[PDB]
Ligand binder design. Sequence first.
Ligand SMILES: [Mn+2]
Ligand SMILES: [Mn+2]
Ligand SMILES: [Mn+2]
Ligand SMILES: [Mn+2]
Ligand SMILES: [Mn+2]
Ligand SMILES: [Mn+2]
Ligand SMILES: [Mn+2]
Ligand SMILES: [Mn+2]
Ligand SMILES: [Mn+2]
Ligand SMILES: [Mn+2]
Ligand SMILES: [Mn+2]
Ligand SMILES: [Mn+2]
Ligand SMILES: [Mn+2]
Ligand SMILES: [Zn+2]
Ligand SMILES: [Zn+2]
Ligand SMILES: [Zn+2]
Ligand SMILES: [Zn+2]
Ligand SMILES: [Zn+2]
Ligand SMILES: [Zn+2]
Ligand SMILES: [Zn+2]
Ligand SMILES: [Zn+2]
Ligand SMILES: [Zn+2]
Ligand SMILES: [Zn+2]
Ligand SMILES: [Zn+2]
Ligand SMILES: [Zn+2]
Ligand SMILES: [Zn+2]
Ligand SMILES: [Zn+2]
Ligand SMILES: [Zn+2]
Ligand SMILES: [Zn+2]
Ligand SMILES: [Zn+2]
Ligand SMILES: [Zn+2]
Ligand SMILES: [Zn+2]
Ligand SMILES: [Zn+2]
Ligand SMILES: [Zn+2]
Ligand SMILES: [Zn+2]
Lengths: 134, 134, 132, 132
Amino acid sequence: MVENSELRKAGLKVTLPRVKILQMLDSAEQRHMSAEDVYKALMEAGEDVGLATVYRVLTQFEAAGLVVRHNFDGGHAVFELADSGAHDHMVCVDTGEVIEFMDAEIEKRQKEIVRERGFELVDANLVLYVRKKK
Amino acid sequence: MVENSELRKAGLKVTLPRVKILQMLDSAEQRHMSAEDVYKALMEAGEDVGLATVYRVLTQFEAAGLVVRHNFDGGHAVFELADSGAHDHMVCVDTGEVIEFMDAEIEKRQKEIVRERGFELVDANLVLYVRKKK
Amino acid sequence: MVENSELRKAGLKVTLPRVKILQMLDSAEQRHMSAEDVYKALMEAGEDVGLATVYRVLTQFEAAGLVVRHNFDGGHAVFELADSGAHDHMVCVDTGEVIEFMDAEIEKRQKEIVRERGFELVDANLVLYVRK
Amino acid sequence: MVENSELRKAGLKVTLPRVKILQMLDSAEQRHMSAEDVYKALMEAGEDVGLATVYRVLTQFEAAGLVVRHNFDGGHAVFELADSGAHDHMVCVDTGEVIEFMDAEIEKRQKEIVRERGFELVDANLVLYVRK
Ligand SMILES: [Mn+2]
Ligand SMILES: [Mn+2]
Ligand SMILES: [Mn+2]
Ligand SMILES: [Mn+2]
Ligand SMILES: [Mn+2]
Ligand SMILES: [Mn+2]
Ligand SMILES: [Mn+2]
Ligand SMILES: [Mn+2]
Ligand SMILES: [Mn+2]
Ligand SMILES: [Mn+2]
Ligand SMILES: [Mn+2]
Ligand SMILES: [Mn+2]
Ligand SMILES: [Mn+2]
Ligand SMILES: [Zn+2]
Ligand SMILES: [Zn+2]
Ligand SMILES: [Zn+2]
Ligand SMILES: [Zn+2]
Ligand SMILES: [Zn+2]
Ligand SMILES: [Zn+2]
Ligand SMILES: [Zn+2]
Ligand SMILES: [Zn+2]
Ligand SMILES: [Zn+2]
Ligand SMILES: [Zn+2]
Ligand SMILES: [Zn+2]
Ligand SMILES: [Zn+2]
Ligand SMILES: [Zn+2]
Ligand SMILES: [Zn+2]
Ligand SMILES: [Zn+2]
Ligand SMILES: [Zn+2]
Ligand SMILES: [Zn+2]
Ligand SMILES: [Zn+2]
Ligand SMILES: [Zn+2]
Ligand SMILES: [Zn+2]
Ligand SMILES: [Zn+2]
Ligand SMILES: [Zn+2]
């Protein structure tokens, strides 16, 4: 996507680090990245952005809604482009593996539960902690 | 419930502060309490437990599974006795009001989504952020 | 008492809530406010900002460097303007009373420690948990 | 190298994972490990502890006072044995390099500040963010 239109969308001055990090997420191979993952990846692509900046920019992106922040294993923060796959996850509680899913039935029931009570749905989070039965 | 059987359940030496705080939760009027709420309430009932202890004991309880920890408004931690109502919440994103719900349809679909993929369900969290439409 | 100029240096478009929250933090300059505390105060003043809007603006400000975020008692987040005094606190473990202090000897020793190591000092944080 | 006696003082029943994780933290005493780092090491050693079990044990230890929890780079939690040295760190903002230091002048001034105020000192934390 057009990073510069997005940064204007979110009320954020277009600056070099903001554009480099957003390009990294857009083009990232792995969908769930730690702040350290983004910093390692920028080094790889030969971009000079310190870990402190990387985390601050991810925090602005989250607050602006560009990115969703999770804590699946409890011990480190995951950032994820804020698209519609970002809200439905199964977590293997023994390995830390994260698996996205989408079930139209559950998406529809969620809107029902909330309208029947006089509300509109702003946002849903569903996390399914799972174990491989055998 | 019998606090002392619970503390043994969870691998926790029975001590005065652990039993006072657990009695407070069991008998609390409000279901979602900050650490500050529990400390204020203990003062009220005329029990001498410092804020630092209160938070540490809640942290042990969470880790032992006796209590569930949420962050609904992003700005403060909520502790909640770990019963079956502790995993399904709507949050009014303008007021911070939290409302528990239970929908048997959604509970059943969640088990389906996970067995059809070779897993057993250890735990589910569902948070519905809502706005009062009018 | 409000500033769009503070927001610009931060690289942040000027908006109703950013301005209202920012001058709220300024016209209440030593309180150590939670997100809820800010939300309550705006309601008094008669603003209309949702609670989630408050917390997202305060997080934007933290990232931008306009505000410092602490968690003193473990339970709730404190948002403080990034002034001199915002990095040195004593904290009463039993009550959660928070108290800013500033000690020039301490602040001098910090810079010497760092200089004697070939580093420059970007920021320091000191928290003293105390009782009695 | 493992201790059920450490666990007892903490008020914690002695269990397989608590013991295995505890001696893992001891036989790797200056690493500043994440929950994942601990989980990986146990797998090497050939233990069988789930990742979520690791993190819950480390949280129990933090609450019990056996371990100190830091978040140095903002992104992941660090779990450190609560020894001397576990509360004073420099931190390279650009790389996340972490370095323990201890300075007796600083440690002396801290106790004077607190004493001159009628307080006793329960715990202090110093973090110096540095570059170059
Ligand atoms: Mn981790
Ligand atoms: Mn709050
Ligand atoms: Mn359904
Ligand atoms: Mn702080
Ligand atoms: Mn609190
Ligand atoms: Mn509090
Ligand atoms: Mn200072
Ligand atoms: Mn000195
Ligand atoms: Mn720390
Ligand atoms: Mn990280
Ligand atoms: Mn990290
Ligand atoms: Mn020290
Ligand atoms: Mn001195
Ligand atoms: Zn792009
Ligand atoms: Zn999450
Ligand atoms: Zn999440
Ligand atoms: Zn979501
Ligand atoms: Zn969804
Ligand atoms: Zn259905
Ligand atoms: Zn979202
Ligand atoms: Zn009871
Ligand atoms: Zn939650
Ligand atoms: Zn929750
Ligand atoms: Zn749950
Ligand atoms: Zn449920
Ligand atoms: Zn269904
Ligand atoms: Zn649970
Ligand atoms: Zn102005
Ligand atoms: Zn101040
Ligand atoms: Zn600071
Ligand atoms: Zn700072
Ligand atoms: Zn032993
Ligand atoms: Zn150490
Ligand atoms: Zn410490
Ligand atoms: Zn400590």
